[PDB]
Design a protein around this ligand. Structure first.
Ligand SMILES: Cn1nc(-c2ccccc2)cc1Nc1cc(O)cc(O)c1C(=O)N1Cc2cccnc2C1
Length: 207
């Protein structure tokens, strides 16, 4: 399942999307939807925000690690949610994505096919997904092109409280996406619509 699908999408997405910066639009869009979900659930059950009071998106580059992390305090995913994403959604969305592609239809927005996650492959050679839903444990899953990694209970990672954290291991020739000014421009250009705070961690540079 996952090995073939991730390999296909890695090839197709890198071939047809020359503007690699849209990966950040897709991730921010997914985070925004997850935040809409917990916001709406908290209307009828305020205690849903007990795990994490604030709703936001935070971007954390780590140049020493070569990673760009996008974390949100959205509703998160149960293990069943993540399993469904990896199985049913990935298979069906890949089919719809490449029929749209073949059709010559406007496929600019990848997430309309439910596989926007894989646009991470524009800039990343592997992604570590950490996620925490109020009804389940914290889980981690690793994605790489051709990879068959198992969803695992995360016992040694930092606690999310609630939400989802996408840690992207940036490609060697694309470290520009770790730079503060480049990230800010991309966010400004592609995320005007978002109604949640978008935060960036900037670190004093030696020097
Ligand atoms: C959209 N999506 N797709 C995959 C996927 C993974 C592998 C293979 C195929 C698909 C995973 C996700 N979830 C997320 C991706 C993010 O970047 C940020 C997030 O906060 C989530 C999240 O926790 N959400 C819960 C939720 C509830 C209601 C509406 N939207 C959401 C999104």
């Amino acid at each position: 399942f996952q090995a073939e699908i991730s390999q296909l999408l890695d090839l197709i997405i890198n071939t047809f999307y020359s503007n690699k910066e849209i990966f950040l639009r897709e991730l921010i869009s997914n985070s925004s939807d997850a935040l809409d979900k917990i916001r709406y659930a908290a209307l009828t059950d305020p205690s849903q925000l007990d795990s994490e009071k604030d709703l936001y998106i935070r971007i954390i580059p780590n140049k020493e690690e070569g990673t760009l992390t996008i974390r949100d305090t959205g509703i998160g995913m149960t293990k069943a949610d993540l399993v469904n994403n990896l199985g049913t959604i990935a298979k069906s969305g890949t089919k719809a994505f490449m029929e749209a592609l073949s059709s010559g239809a406007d496929i600019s927005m990848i997430g309309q096919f439910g596989v926007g996650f894989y646009s991470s492959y524009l800039v990343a050679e592997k992604v570590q997904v950490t996620t925490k839903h109020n009804d389940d444990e914290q889980y981690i899953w690793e994605s790489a092109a051709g990879g068959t990694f198992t969803i695992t209970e995360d016992t040694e990672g930092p606690r999310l409280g609630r939400g989802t954290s996408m840690k992207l291991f940036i490609k060697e020739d694309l470290k520009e996406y770790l730079e503060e000014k480049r990230i800010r421009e991309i966010v400004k250009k592609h995320s005007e619509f978002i109604s949640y705070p978008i935060q960036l961690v900037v670190t004093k540079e030696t020097e």
